[PDB]
Amino acid sequence: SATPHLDAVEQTLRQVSPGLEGDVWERTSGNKLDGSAADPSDWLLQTPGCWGDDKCADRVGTKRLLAKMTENIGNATRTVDISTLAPFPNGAFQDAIVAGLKESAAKGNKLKVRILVGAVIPSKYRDELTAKLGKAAENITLNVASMTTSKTAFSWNHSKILVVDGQSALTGGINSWKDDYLDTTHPVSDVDLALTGPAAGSAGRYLDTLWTWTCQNKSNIASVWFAASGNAGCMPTMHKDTNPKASPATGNVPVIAVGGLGVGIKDVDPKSTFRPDLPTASDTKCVVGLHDNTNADRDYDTVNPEESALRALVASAKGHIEISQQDLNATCPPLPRYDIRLYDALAAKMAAGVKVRIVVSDPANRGYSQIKSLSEISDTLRNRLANITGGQQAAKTAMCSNLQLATFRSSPNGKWADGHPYAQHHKLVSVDSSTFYIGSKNLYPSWLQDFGYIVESPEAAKQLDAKLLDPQWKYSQETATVDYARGICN
Numbered sequence: 001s002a003t004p005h006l007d008a009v010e011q012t013l014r015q016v017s018p019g020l021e022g023d024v025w026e027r028t029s030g031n032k033l034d035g036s037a038a039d040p041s042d043w044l045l046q047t048p049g050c051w052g053d054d055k056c057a058d059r060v061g062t063k064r065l066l067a068k069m070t071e072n073i074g075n076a077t078r079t080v081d082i083s084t085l086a087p088f089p090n091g092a093f094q095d096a097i098v099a100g101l102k103e104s105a106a107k108g109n110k111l112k113v114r115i116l117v118g119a120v121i122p123s124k125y126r127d128e129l130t131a132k133l134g135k136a137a138e139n140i141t142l143n144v145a146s147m148t149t150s151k152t153a154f155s156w157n158h159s160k161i162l163v164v165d166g167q168s169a170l171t172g173g174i175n176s177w178k179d180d181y182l183d184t185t186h187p188v189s190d191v192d193l194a195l196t197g198p199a200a201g202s203a204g205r206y207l208d209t210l211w212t213w214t215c216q217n218k219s220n221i222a223s224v225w226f227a228a229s230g231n232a233g234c235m236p237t238m239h240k241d242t243n244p245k246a247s248p249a250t251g252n253v254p255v256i257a258v259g260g261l262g263v264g265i266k267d268v269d270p271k272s273t274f275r276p277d278l279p280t281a282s283d284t285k286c287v288v289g290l291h292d293n294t295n296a297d298r299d300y301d302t303v304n305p306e307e308s309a310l311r312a313l314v315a316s317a318k319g320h321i322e323i324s325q326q327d328l329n330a331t332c333p334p335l336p337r338y339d340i341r342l343y344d345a346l347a348a349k350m351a352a353g354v355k356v357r358i359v360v361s362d363p364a365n366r367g368y369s370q371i372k373s374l375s376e377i378s379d380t381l382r383n384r385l386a387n388i389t390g391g392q393q394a395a396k397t398a399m400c401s402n403l404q405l406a407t408f409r410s411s412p413n414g415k416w417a418d419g420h421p422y423a424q425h426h427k428l429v430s431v432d433s434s435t436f437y438i439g440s441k442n443l444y445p446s447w448l449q450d451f452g453y454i455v456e457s458p459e460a461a462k463q464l465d466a467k468l469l470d471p472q473w474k475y476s477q478e479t480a481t482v483d484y485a486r487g488i489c490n
């Protein structure tokens with residue numbers, strides 16, 4: 001097969017979540033990574049993109065991110081569909097959205113627009129946007145909502161998607177928060193991707209799934225705050241109703257779109273006959289009373305295929321795996337400390353000689369960090385390795401021979417020049433310089449609505465190496481507590 005990694009991930013998803021195929025996950029062909037002619041790798045919307053410079057003077061990443069948001073929205077003829085984590089977009093993120101909407105209106109288009117956040121706010125944002133659009137607002141039917149799907153399971157939207165006409169999609173880890181990303185001399189390091197094709201339709205069907213729940217629950221104040229322009233109603237199926245069921249083809253790139261429904265939207269996929277072997281405990285559940293959806297809830301997996309997809313992506317690797325995250329571990333309580341099956345999958349790979357690189361955010365950020373020390377990751381990997389290598393000594397040897405583990409830097413300085421630690425927020429997994437995930441789903445335990453793309457394209461994977469992973473390792477490797485390539489083993 002030309003797509004061994006997607007084939008494996010797809011076979012897992014059809015067992016886990018067959019009833020959600022089409023809507024919460026979907027494999028498509030015919031996509032394109034949407035870079036420019038001058039810089040074809042710039043589908044990779046990293047921010048700030050100021051490698052080597054502790055003053056972050058030339059933010060080529062940020063500039064491209066904001067320009068691409070405006071360009072995509074400005075090309076809308078029918079729909080603009082945005083999700084993010086609250087607060088609602090501000091600063092130059094909001095400026096980019098307003099500029100694009102004004103551009104589309106001036107080209108003569110009448111648009112439907114949805115903006116969904118996970119949590120007086122929605123009405124205030126709607127009014128700010130309408131004021132800023134001026135006469136362009138007459139061309140726009142707007143829905144704005146904030147939502148929480150479960151208080152007790154801490155579940156709300158965490159996806160960060162911008163879909164236009166069901167044709168183009170931007171998604172990734174970037175929240176639209178000016179103070180953390182933009183107006184600061186210690187900007188957060190993160191990444192989105194830009195694509196076009198049928199996979200953008202997949203994102204539109206995912207957002208229809210979320211808005212269908214949101215509109216059904218719009219009169220329940222504890223769950224949903226909703227605001228619309230004029231006399232407009234809630235639009236649960238804007239994508240289905242307005243865009244073609246199969247988006248046009250734009251290229252040759254195969255993609256698996258995958259997300260999750262968190263807790264409180266749907267309890268189980270009734271079509272699933274998935275019956276997992278659930279790992280033998282570990283020291284993940286810090287307290288006996290906590291209900292652990294990540295490690296001990298089969299039904300949760302069936303409505304959160306993204307967890308299984310990411311674990312399957314790791315399992316598909318033949319040579320090497322690079323992981324860039326804010327964290328691998330969560331704060332307990334209320335979440336379990338780690339995904340046991342994920343760490344087991346990484347351990348299985350290292351026991352087989354497949355190299356694993358994990359770069360996380362500096363604990364000095366703890367907040368863009370949830371651990372005190374990298375030992376909280378290496379101890380856990382070592383303990384899971386011990387189950388499959390015969391003991392603690394053989395686990396340590398396997399780990400030290402196959403692991404790179406470090407905290408993130410983007411220049412030679414240990415911190416930004418302004419003295420603040422580097423914070424990173426990517427949700428990135430790449431395997432074999434072939435297949436990668438970029439999206440909103442963290443690898444640390446979390447029970448939110450999330451979404452992302454798994455792309456199998458060696459060309460694009462090589463671009464990701466050159467533009468992000470290689471520079472990251474260049475500067476980050478100085479903090480490594482384990483690095484097989486240099487014989488480091490603390």
Ligand SMILES: *[PH-](=O)([O-])[O-]
Pocket residue numbers: 085158173175440442
């Ligand atoms: P996310 O925006 O919490 O990772």
